[model samples]
Target: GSSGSSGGTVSATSPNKCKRPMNAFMLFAKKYRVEYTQMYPGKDNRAISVILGDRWKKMKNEERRMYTLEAKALAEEQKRLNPDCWK
Candidate 1:
């Protein structure tokens, strides 16, 4: 067997692992990707990833703030769980 990690993943600051919070732009994609897929059925998610950026840029600050706040709250949760992540 391998001389390291006896089981699965571990979270640590010294020799660590942590999950990153998904940023606001990706939150936009989470919603928009479904709608965009409907518009172009069978389109690859990779294609949507690029298209979403264009749409996200054109989106208004009012709408953008929603996802930003959502991501911010979620990031707070992540930080609370993995306190080592920030430092």
Candidate 2:
């Protein structure tokens, strides 16, 4: 059968395989990961990630709101594009 033709079938729910919408923290992380890495050239990713996490936690609510809005917009756009992806 066609099912046996390939080595295996792909599933949507595979870990890290799907492009799920980002939340505010994820958006923040995406925006700053590279910048932080460059800022501390010799530092490891774990250190940079911890710094980013601290920065996000310490940011003012006003600053955080911008990313929140951006994330919500992205999620809505994704939902519009793939209506079936959401429950």
Among all windows of 10 consecutive residues in model 1, the one with the lowest summed lDDT is: 1-10
Q: What are the per-residue Cα lDDT tens digits for candidate 1 across 41-76?
A: 778877988889998899899879999999888867
Per-model TM values vs. the true structure: 0.64, 0.73
TM-score of 2: 0.73
lDDT of 1 at 57: 90
Candidate 2: residue pairs that collide: none
lDDT of 1 at 43: 81
- Candidate 2 at residue 29, lDDT? 88
Taking the candidates one at a time, how many backbone clashes does each contain? 0, 0
